[PDB]
Design a protein around this ligand. Structure first.
Ligand SMILES: *C(=O)N1C[C@H](NOS(=O)(=O)O)CC[C@H]1C(N)=O
Ligand SMILES: *C(=O)N1C[C@H](NOS(=O)(=O)O)CC[C@H]1C(N)=O
Lengths: 243, 242
């Protein structure tokens, strides 16, 4: 009853030569839906979806003063062109600018990172590995259903950080908005440790409800990255959440 | 600081319309408009007043937060979306006048005036009914004054809480995608001539913000869509949005 399995959504994966899980949570009904309960509860490296808790911690500790503070480019030209420029929190999140977030993590430090994540009840809460990459090749692991629990807290300002920090992060998560819905979310691509997987987690705000979502899918090559959003939107469209 | 670009009149004329678009490039600190005189013509703000009103209501605790439900008072009105319970997000989205009339009544004449003075909002004149002065009272604000007010809101420089300013900016969210984000509020002044439409707000880009304030003659509701369409035609011309 709390979590129901809806295997019809596999069609959206199969039709895109893909495999994964979409987890949906109807906030009003307090009911959850997924195509794969086992994978929905399978813990994976959060990769860039960790930018959500990382942003929160950095804002609450003053490592990030606000969403306008500029994080200068360190001069090192990296494979993703949008990272080779100055950023603020909005564009660092939009473009998933790793080096900015690595710098935040170093400033936050192992001790505060660890104990702040416990406050968030975040995945296995294990930050073992490099302080600037544990979310990518360290010990930390989070499931799609755990992403939803974490995101619901963020949504309701129930994390144990300031309302302000939560509001700023939810601003930074803004992905898409029109007269039908608003999506606040963060993508992720876990590439360093097998299985390579793509994430999209967040929620869709409607006029009278919110639908949280967490999906992940096998991502052996970057060519499928756009399917993280597309498959999710096919599920949302199937469920009449978005037109 | 204000430069005229008459080529933008094409977007009014071609739509069998007349108005002004005012644009401010925040980075360059330069303003552009198709009609300098109309850019400075003060008009009734109509529903664009939902911006300061929300701000004031939030700061005074009249609105606890964006989730607080404003129960429908029971009166069924013409615009179908107003005949239901609302929160600040949807009240704003649909421009639900009754919810805002109720806010203005709770805020009260004295606190409203003080706030608008502190905001340096238009002529700062709340004369008329406490619950309709923005529609048929003395308050008048120009496109350029809207921009000045909106720039304050954007930088949290208004004298209300930072929180209030954040919540109102959230509530102003109109459209967002990988190219831009628009935070804005539409308006339609129907009760006092000249009947006009408004769209004021801004477009956030990655590395800049373009504030905009447009108003246009609106003798019939047929042209209400042009408030956005003309502005976007201007924004598209300037390569601000694709
Ligand atoms: C995050 O997972 N990463 C940083 C960046 N994010 O792009 S994503 O948001 O679309 O997932 C590239 C992928 C990954 C990384 N290589 O660190
Ligand atoms: C606001 O100016 N009004 C309330 C509502 N707003 O819709 S609008 O923002 O698209 O202009 C209808 C028009 C107007 C009114 N009748 O008071």
């Amino acid at each position: 009853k709390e979590w129901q399995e809806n295997k019809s959504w596999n069609a959206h994966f199969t039709e895109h030569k893909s495999q994964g899980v979409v987890v949906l949570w109807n906030e009003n009904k307090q009911q959850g839906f997924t195509n794969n309960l086992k994978r929905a509860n399978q813990a994976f490296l959060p990769a860039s979806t960790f930018k959500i808790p990382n942003s929160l911690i950095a804002l609450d500790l003053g490592v990030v003063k606000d969403e306008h503070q500029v994080f200068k480019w360190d001069g090192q030209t990296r494979d993703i062109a949008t990272w080779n420029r100055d950023h603020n929190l909005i564009t660092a999140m939009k473009y998933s600018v790793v080096p900015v977030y690595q710098e935040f993590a170093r400033q936050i430090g192992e001790a505060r990172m660890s104990k702040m994540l416990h406050a968030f009840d975040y995945g296995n809460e294990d930050i073992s590995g490099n302080v600037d990459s544990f979310w990518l090749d360290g010990g930390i692991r989070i499931s799609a259903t755990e992403q939803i629990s974490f995101l619901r807290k963020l949504y309701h300002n129930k994390l144990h950080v300031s309302e302000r920090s939560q509001r700023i992060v939810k601003q930074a998560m803004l992905t898409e908005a029109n007269g039908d819905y608003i999506i606040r979310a963060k993508t992720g691509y876990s590439t360093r440790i097998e299985p390579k997987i793509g994430w999209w987690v967040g929620w869709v705000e409607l006029d009278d409800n919110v639908w949280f979502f967490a999906m992940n899918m096998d991502m052996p090559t970057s060519d499928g990255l756009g399917l993280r959003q597309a498959i999710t939107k096919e599920v949302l469209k199937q469920e009449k959440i978005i037109p």
